[PDB]
Design a protein around this ligand. Structure first.
Ligand SMILES: CCCCCCCCOC[C@H](COP(=O)(O)OCCN)OP(=O)(O)CCCCCCC
Ligand SMILES: CCCCCCCCOC[C@H](COP(=O)(O)OCCN)OP(=O)(O)CCCCCCC
Ligand SMILES: [Ca+2]
Ligand SMILES: [Ca+2]
Ligand SMILES: [Ca+2]
Ligand SMILES: [Ca+2]
Lengths: 118, 118
Protein backbone atom coordinates (compact mmCIF):
# COMPACT_ATOMS: atom_id res chain seq x y z
CA UNK A 1 0.00 0.00 0.00
CA UNK A 2 1.05 3.65 -0.52
CA UNK A 3 2.13 4.01 3.12
CA UNK A 4 4.55 1.10 2.58
CA UNK A 5 5.72 2.45 -0.75
CA UNK A 6 6.84 5.72 0.86
CA UNK A 7 8.76 3.67 3.50
CA UNK A 8 10.37 1.80 0.60
CA UNK A 9 11.46 5.15 -0.83
CA UNK A 10 12.85 6.04 2.64
CA UNK A 11 14.92 2.90 2.52
CA UNK A 12 16.63 3.70 -0.79
CA UNK A 13 16.68 7.55 -0.80
CA UNK A 14 17.51 8.69 2.76
CA UNK A 15 17.73 12.53 2.41
CA UNK A 16 15.07 13.44 0.00
CA UNK A 17 11.56 13.65 1.49
CA UNK A 18 9.09 11.21 -0.09
CA UNK A 19 6.94 14.24 -0.80
CA UNK A 20 9.58 15.42 -3.33
CA UNK A 21 8.39 12.66 -5.72
CA UNK A 22 4.63 13.25 -5.30
CA UNK A 23 4.54 15.89 -8.11
CA UNK A 24 7.51 15.43 -10.44
CA UNK A 25 7.61 15.38 -14.25
CA UNK A 26 4.75 13.94 -16.25
CA UNK A 27 4.35 10.58 -14.44
CA UNK A 28 5.34 11.08 -10.69
CA UNK A 29 2.15 11.54 -8.83
CA UNK A 30 -1.38 10.31 -9.44
CA UNK A 31 -1.77 9.20 -13.04
CA UNK A 32 0.62 10.37 -15.74
CA UNK A 33 0.97 10.41 -19.52
CA UNK A 34 3.05 11.90 -22.30
CA UNK A 35 6.81 11.73 -22.69
CA UNK A 36 8.93 11.16 -19.54
CA UNK A 37 10.95 14.30 -18.91
CA UNK A 38 13.96 12.36 -17.49
CA UNK A 39 15.15 9.04 -15.99
CA UNK A 40 13.42 9.73 -12.66
CA UNK A 41 10.13 10.39 -14.51
CA UNK A 42 10.64 7.17 -16.41
CA UNK A 43 10.90 5.11 -13.17
CA UNK A 44 7.44 6.41 -12.40
CA UNK A 45 6.01 5.54 -15.78
CA UNK A 46 7.10 1.87 -15.54
CA UNK A 47 5.86 1.93 -11.87
CA UNK A 48 2.49 3.24 -13.12
CA UNK A 49 2.46 0.57 -15.85
CA UNK A 50 3.47 -2.06 -13.32
CA UNK A 51 0.41 -1.03 -11.26
CA UNK A 52 -1.76 -1.24 -14.38
CA UNK A 53 -0.73 -4.92 -14.70
CA UNK A 54 -1.31 -5.82 -11.04
CA UNK A 55 -4.85 -4.39 -11.29
CA UNK A 56 -5.57 -6.92 -14.05
CA UNK A 57 -5.50 -9.52 -11.30
CA UNK A 58 -9.03 -8.88 -10.17
CA UNK A 59 -9.83 -7.70 -6.74
CA UNK A 60 -6.26 -6.28 -6.64
CA UNK A 61 -5.99 -2.56 -5.78
CA UNK A 62 -2.32 -1.53 -5.66
CA UNK A 63 -2.97 1.59 -3.59
CA UNK A 64 -4.43 -0.19 -0.54
CA UNK A 65 -3.05 -3.75 -0.71
CA UNK A 66 -0.58 -4.20 2.12
CA UNK A 67 2.29 -6.60 1.58
CA UNK A 68 5.34 -7.96 3.41
CA UNK A 69 8.80 -6.69 2.63
CA UNK A 70 12.13 -5.83 4.26
CA UNK A 71 14.60 -2.95 4.14
CA UNK A 72 18.27 -3.84 4.84
CA UNK A 73 20.43 -0.72 4.38
CA UNK A 74 19.57 0.39 0.84
CA UNK A 75 18.13 -2.93 -0.38
CA UNK A 76 14.62 -4.35 -0.47
CA UNK A 77 13.00 -7.81 -0.79
CA UNK A 78 9.37 -8.93 -0.54
CA UNK A 79 8.77 -11.53 2.13
CA UNK A 80 6.29 -14.27 3.03
CA UNK A 81 2.56 -13.89 3.61
CA UNK A 82 1.86 -12.23 0.27
CA UNK A 83 -1.03 -13.39 -1.91
CA UNK A 84 -0.82 -12.92 -5.72
CA UNK A 85 -1.83 -9.25 -5.44
CA UNK A 86 0.52 -8.31 -2.61
CA UNK A 87 3.40 -10.10 -4.37
CA UNK A 88 2.85 -8.15 -7.60
CA UNK A 89 2.42 -4.65 -6.12
CA UNK A 90 5.30 -5.32 -3.67
CA UNK A 91 7.48 -6.11 -6.70
CA UNK A 92 6.26 -2.92 -8.45
CA UNK A 93 7.10 -0.77 -5.43
CA UNK A 94 10.47 -2.46 -4.82
CA UNK A 95 11.66 -1.90 -8.42
CA UNK A 96 10.41 1.74 -8.38
CA UNK A 97 12.10 2.65 -5.08
CA UNK A 98 15.28 1.03 -6.42
CA UNK A 99 14.96 3.06 -9.63
CA UNK A 100 14.47 6.37 -7.75
CA UNK A 101 17.83 5.94 -6.02
CA UNK A 102 19.82 5.62 -9.31
CA UNK A 103 18.20 8.55 -11.13
CA UNK A 104 19.26 12.20 -10.60
CA UNK A 105 16.57 14.48 -9.15
CA UNK A 106 16.14 17.68 -11.19
CA UNK A 107 14.31 20.44 -9.25
CA UNK A 108 13.44 22.08 -12.54
CA UNK A 109 11.18 19.06 -13.18
CA UNK A 110 9.08 19.38 -9.97
CA UNK A 111 5.55 20.74 -10.28
CA UNK A 112 5.74 21.49 -14.00
CA UNK A 113 2.94 22.60 -16.26
CA UNK A 114 1.59 19.19 -17.27
CA UNK A 115 -0.42 20.95 -19.96
CA UNK A 116 2.70 22.50 -21.56
CA UNK A 117 5.24 19.65 -21.22
CA UNK A 118 3.27 16.36 -21.25
CA UNK B 1 25.93 35.07 -39.42
CA UNK B 2 26.79 32.74 -36.55
CA UNK B 3 29.69 34.93 -35.31
CA UNK B 4 27.26 37.81 -34.94
CA UNK B 5 24.67 35.59 -33.24
CA UNK B 6 27.32 34.55 -30.72
CA UNK B 7 27.85 38.23 -29.97
CA UNK B 8 24.11 38.84 -29.66
CA UNK B 9 23.96 36.17 -26.92
CA UNK B 10 26.86 37.94 -25.29
CA UNK B 11 24.71 41.04 -25.35
CA UNK B 12 21.70 39.52 -23.52
CA UNK B 13 23.36 36.72 -21.44
CA UNK B 14 26.89 37.92 -20.62
CA UNK B 15 27.25 35.53 -17.67
CA UNK B 16 27.07 32.36 -19.77
CA UNK B 17 29.35 31.01 -22.50
CA UNK B 18 27.66 30.61 -25.88
CA UNK B 19 29.06 27.05 -25.79
CA UNK B 20 26.40 26.20 -23.21
CA UNK B 21 23.66 26.74 -25.79
CA UNK B 22 25.40 24.85 -28.60
CA UNK B 23 24.41 21.34 -27.35
CA UNK B 24 21.25 21.64 -25.28
CA UNK B 25 17.92 19.83 -25.28
CA UNK B 26 16.52 18.46 -28.51
CA UNK B 27 16.82 21.70 -30.53
CA UNK B 28 19.79 23.92 -29.45
CA UNK B 29 22.62 22.83 -31.80
CA UNK B 30 22.64 21.82 -35.51
CA UNK B 31 19.16 20.54 -36.45
CA UNK B 32 16.58 19.32 -33.92
CA UNK B 33 13.41 17.26 -33.52
CA UNK B 34 11.15 15.67 -30.91
CA UNK B 35 9.47 17.49 -28.03
CA UNK B 36 11.21 20.61 -26.63
CA UNK B 37 12.58 19.63 -23.27
CA UNK B 38 11.95 22.99 -21.54
CA UNK B 39 11.51 26.70 -22.32
CA UNK B 40 15.12 27.26 -23.43
CA UNK B 41 14.77 24.34 -25.88
CA UNK B 42 11.59 25.97 -27.20
CA UNK B 43 13.64 29.13 -27.88
CA UNK B 44 15.82 27.03 -30.19
CA UNK B 45 12.88 25.22 -31.78
CA UNK B 46 11.34 28.59 -32.68
CA UNK B 47 14.73 29.87 -33.89
CA UNK B 48 15.20 26.81 -36.10
CA UNK B 49 11.78 27.43 -37.67
CA UNK B 50 12.65 31.11 -38.19
CA UNK B 51 15.77 30.12 -40.14
CA UNK B 52 13.75 27.66 -42.24
CA UNK B 53 11.46 30.57 -43.11
CA UNK B 54 14.41 32.79 -44.01
CA UNK B 55 15.76 30.04 -46.29
CA UNK B 56 12.71 30.51 -48.53
CA UNK B 57 14.20 33.87 -49.53
CA UNK B 58 16.18 33.03 -52.66
CA UNK B 59 19.93 33.05 -52.07
CA UNK B 60 19.36 33.32 -48.30
CA UNK B 61 21.58 31.19 -46.05
CA UNK B 62 21.00 32.20 -42.40
CA UNK B 63 24.19 30.61 -41.02
CA UNK B 64 26.42 32.75 -43.26
CA UNK B 65 24.56 36.04 -44.02
CA UNK B 66 26.03 39.03 -42.18
CA UNK B 67 23.62 41.71 -41.00
CA UNK B 68 23.74 45.06 -39.15
CA UNK B 69 22.60 45.33 -35.58
CA UNK B 70 23.61 47.02 -32.37
CA UNK B 71 23.68 45.93 -28.78
CA UNK B 72 22.81 48.62 -26.25
CA UNK B 73 22.69 47.79 -22.58
CA UNK B 74 21.06 44.34 -22.86
CA UNK B 75 18.71 45.25 -25.70
CA UNK B 76 19.18 44.32 -29.36
CA UNK B 77 18.13 46.12 -32.59
CA UNK B 78 18.70 45.37 -36.28
CA UNK B 79 19.94 48.41 -38.21
CA UNK B 80 20.15 49.88 -41.70
CA UNK B 81 22.03 48.25 -44.56
CA UNK B 82 20.24 44.88 -44.43
CA UNK B 83 18.71 43.38 -47.56
CA UNK B 84 15.69 41.06 -47.37
CA UNK B 85 17.81 38.09 -46.27
CA UNK B 86 19.92 39.96 -43.67
CA UNK B 87 16.86 41.62 -42.14
CA UNK B 88 15.00 38.30 -41.80
CA UNK B 89 18.02 36.52 -40.27
CA UNK B 90 18.91 39.40 -37.96
CA UNK B 91 15.35 39.35 -36.61
CA UNK B 92 15.45 35.57 -36.14
CA UNK B 93 18.71 35.84 -34.12
CA UNK B 94 17.51 38.92 -32.27
CA UNK B 95 14.42 37.13 -30.95
CA UNK B 96 16.40 33.98 -30.05
CA UNK B 97 18.99 35.85 -27.92
CA UNK B 98 16.20 37.75 -26.15
CA UNK B 99 14.43 34.42 -25.51
CA UNK B 100 17.55 32.73 -24.03
CA UNK B 101 17.91 35.55 -21.51
CA UNK B 102 14.38 34.87 -20.19
CA UNK B 103 14.61 31.08 -19.87
CA UNK B 104 16.12 29.10 -16.98
CA UNK B 105 19.17 27.03 -17.91
CA UNK B 106 18.84 23.47 -16.62
CA UNK B 107 22.20 21.72 -16.51
CA UNK B 108 20.57 18.28 -16.72
CA UNK B 109 19.48 19.15 -20.27
CA UNK B 110 22.96 19.87 -21.66
CA UNK B 111 24.40 17.23 -24.02
CA UNK B 112 21.50 14.80 -23.53
CA UNK B 113 21.13 11.45 -25.30
CA UNK B 114 19.14 12.62 -28.31
CA UNK B 115 18.20 9.04 -29.34
CA UNK B 116 16.78 8.34 -25.87
CA UNK B 117 15.15 11.67 -25.12
CA UNK B 118 14.09 13.20 -28.45
C1 LIG C 1 -2.15 14.87 -3.71
C2 LIG C 1 -1.17 13.85 -4.29
C3 LIG C 1 -1.50 12.39 -3.97
C4 LIG C 1 -0.44 11.69 -3.15
C5 LIG C 1 0.21 10.48 -3.75
C6 LIG C 1 -0.24 9.62 -4.90
C7 LIG C 1 0.79 8.76 -5.55
C8 LIG C 1 0.92 7.38 -4.96
O1 LIG C 1 1.29 6.46 -5.99
C9 LIG C 1 1.13 7.08 -7.26
C10 LIG C 1 1.80 6.31 -8.32
C11 LIG C 1 1.22 5.04 -8.82
O2 LIG C 1 -0.11 5.16 -9.18
P1 LIG C 1 -0.77 5.99 -10.36
O3 LIG C 1 0.04 7.11 -10.84
O4 LIG C 1 -2.19 6.31 -10.01
O5 LIG C 1 -0.62 4.69 -11.20
C12 LIG C 1 -1.02 4.34 -12.48
C13 LIG C 1 -1.92 3.12 -12.37
N1 LIG C 1 -3.28 3.54 -12.79
O6 LIG C 1 3.21 6.05 -8.05
P2 LIG C 1 4.29 7.07 -8.70
O7 LIG C 1 5.14 6.15 -9.53
O8 LIG C 1 3.58 7.83 -9.76
C14 LIG C 1 5.26 7.97 -7.47
C15 LIG C 1 4.53 8.76 -6.40
C16 LIG C 1 5.40 8.99 -5.17
C17 LIG C 1 4.59 9.00 -3.86
C18 LIG C 1 5.31 8.36 -2.70
C19 LIG C 1 4.36 7.99 -1.58
C20 LIG C 1 2.88 7.60 -1.26
C1 LIG D 1 30.58 30.23 -34.00
C2 LIG D 1 30.06 28.92 -34.57
C3 LIG D 1 29.52 27.90 -33.59
C4 LIG D 1 28.79 26.69 -34.13
C5 LIG D 1 27.55 26.24 -33.39
C6 LIG D 1 26.60 25.24 -33.98
C7 LIG D 1 25.13 25.46 -33.67
C8 LIG D 1 24.23 25.75 -34.88
O1 LIG D 1 23.48 26.91 -34.51
C9 LIG D 1 22.41 27.26 -35.41
C10 LIG D 1 21.07 26.85 -34.88
C11 LIG D 1 19.88 26.92 -35.85
O2 LIG D 1 20.20 26.21 -37.05
P1 LIG D 1 19.64 24.73 -37.33
O3 LIG D 1 19.53 23.97 -36.09
O4 LIG D 1 20.48 24.14 -38.41
O5 LIG D 1 18.30 25.24 -37.95
C12 LIG D 1 18.01 25.44 -39.32
C13 LIG D 1 17.08 24.35 -39.77
N1 LIG D 1 16.31 24.89 -40.93
O6 LIG D 1 20.60 27.76 -33.81
P2 LIG D 1 20.14 27.09 -32.42
O7 LIG D 1 18.86 27.82 -32.11
O8 LIG D 1 19.72 25.70 -32.72
C14 LIG D 1 21.29 27.18 -30.99
C15 LIG D 1 22.70 27.54 -31.31
C16 LIG D 1 23.55 27.96 -30.13
C17 LIG D 1 24.99 28.22 -30.56
C18 LIG D 1 25.15 29.64 -31.11
C19 LIG D 1 26.15 29.66 -32.26
C20 LIG D 1 26.95 30.93 -32.35
CA1 LIG E 1 3.58 14.28 -12.22
CA1 LIG F 1 2.11 8.13 -11.61
CA1 LIG G 1 20.55 19.60 -29.11
CA1 LIG H 1 18.61 23.85 -33.75
Amino acid sequence: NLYQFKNMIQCTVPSRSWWDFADYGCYCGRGGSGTPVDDLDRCCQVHDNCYNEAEKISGCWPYFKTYSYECSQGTLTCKGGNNACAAAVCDCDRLAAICFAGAPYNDNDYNINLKARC
